[model samples]
Target: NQKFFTLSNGNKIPAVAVVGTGTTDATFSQELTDIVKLSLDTVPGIVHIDAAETYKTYPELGAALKETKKPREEIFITDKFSSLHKISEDPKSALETALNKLGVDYVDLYLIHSPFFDKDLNIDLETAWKQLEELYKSGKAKNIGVSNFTVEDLKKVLAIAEIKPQVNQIEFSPFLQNQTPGIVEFSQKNDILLEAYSPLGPLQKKPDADQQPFYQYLKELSEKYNKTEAQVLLLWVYKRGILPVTTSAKIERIKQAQDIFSFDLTEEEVKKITDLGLQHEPVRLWHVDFYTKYNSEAQ
Candidate 1:
């Protein structure tokens, strides 16, 4: 079985997994857990507990994950950005709360969810990255990363960070490609893996007339290459070395995304798609005030 590439710290990760979006409540935590386990058992790969949103507020959700201790290798705990930002304000107290609440001495990976938020969020992240740096230096977290951050935002962290971010999680799809070329290049140059969320594009309740270009072009490429639209997009992102976090409730869609390894896009095909650059401004789900509040050095 092909495994996702290992990080600089030498931890093997799956190229893809059923990541917990953390939108459900504790009552539904079991369902999420079962889904992760089932994906692992059925697919045989790493499972990232993206409990960032849900678990950040409700630390009790940690207990649900602890039950899968026997297969520890298959599990990874991802703390929510909000919680990390909270912990940033009072590093000592927040760390204490997180450690106490989660009942774990160390988390595998910790990610800053957004660029900015309230005072608590700003204060928490301002100090949290340094603390997380210390954690990485001490070997507590195998890796430290961030999500929904812009190129400028990442540079701000890089300025004072003792340990560089190992990953930059962002919204990357055919529709919303990574617009800032410098950030993408910098991350690659610095060895930071860019993890793409919404790799298949944001959920659309109804298809829009404007999206005709996306689907139409996608369909053309799909048939031309004998691939699904999703597969084409997945392959495009994969070729860029972006570890895509693709998810689906349907088993078939999940398998389809997973079957991206069989083929490669030619240079011409890649150029054809690359020619179709960002069609719309990227839409962030949270942290609306991030760009307005924070500015980082852009190369």
Candidate 2:
């Protein structure tokens, strides 16, 4: 099987994209850049880097790209506008700023970070999407998409889009599958590639009693396939045609994640895991409260 998924525009994206850097801090130092370089050099089968204006790691990512000396075409770079706030200020300029920061002429994929509210706490889908469409036409972005959009939010964009979104990146895991069943179904029927961020669940949260059965299943499969639990979890996501964007500063973990293509899960096994996962409630790491606060403030 091909190791990549072909986008609507005929662009082939690797099954796994490494999400290095962070929005949590302002530290984009050489040490962090070194970690980025290590991932590029050590991680096998990594074709994309999931980046964003809010991450504040663009310059370091740029430096890592230079250090690795990989051809620009060889690495697929995905970035996003700062936030709803910045895109509201000007989506076009926000993209331009990202390009400058990353020292790249164009991004393989450009996405709006969220669909709900901008930093100004306003709903401005029309303005944001129109600018993205222009960017795609101008070739500054090979393809454009959105993140954190619900089925309703997607319909809003589709209703007015000159160029339909080619991808929808969201928080997905078997544990949280029930939360957005409609969105998942809608994206699949529409041919919009679903990208999963935090596919392995959050770092701060642990699986509870209800999820133990699912974890045990992952363990069984880990041993069965001779893979780590992380790999097993990623393959489960891969089986459903979702691209997972994962991150780790550890080289071993990076290598472990890329090894998913070597095995396949049986239909029965997939069902067993799926059924077990649905028994628990969804674990949403990025809560609605963040947007709620911004929304209230914006008003």
**RMSD in order of candidates:** 4.4, 4.4
By TM-score, how accurate is candidate 1?
A: 0.75
Q: Find the candidate with the highest lDDT and give its number.
A: 2
Candidate 2: which pairs clash? 84-118, 84-119, 85-118, 85-119
At residue 70, what lDDT does model 2 achieve? 64
The true-versus-predicted C-alpha distance at residue 187 of model 2, in Å, is 1.0
TM for every model, in the order presented, reads 0.75, 0.89
Model 2 CA lDDT for position 178: 30
Relative to the true structure, how large is the alpha-carbon lDDT of every model? Answer: 0.62, 0.76
**Candidate 1 least-lDDT 10 residues:** 290-299
Model 1 clash count equals 4
lDDT string for model 1 (1-299, tens) is 44476676666666654455454333545555565545545654456555564245334345554554436666666654465235445333454466566666766777776665546554545587877777677765667888776677788888888777888877666555553446677777787888777666534421574465655676788888787877887778877788777766665676666677767788876666655635433533333354323222211
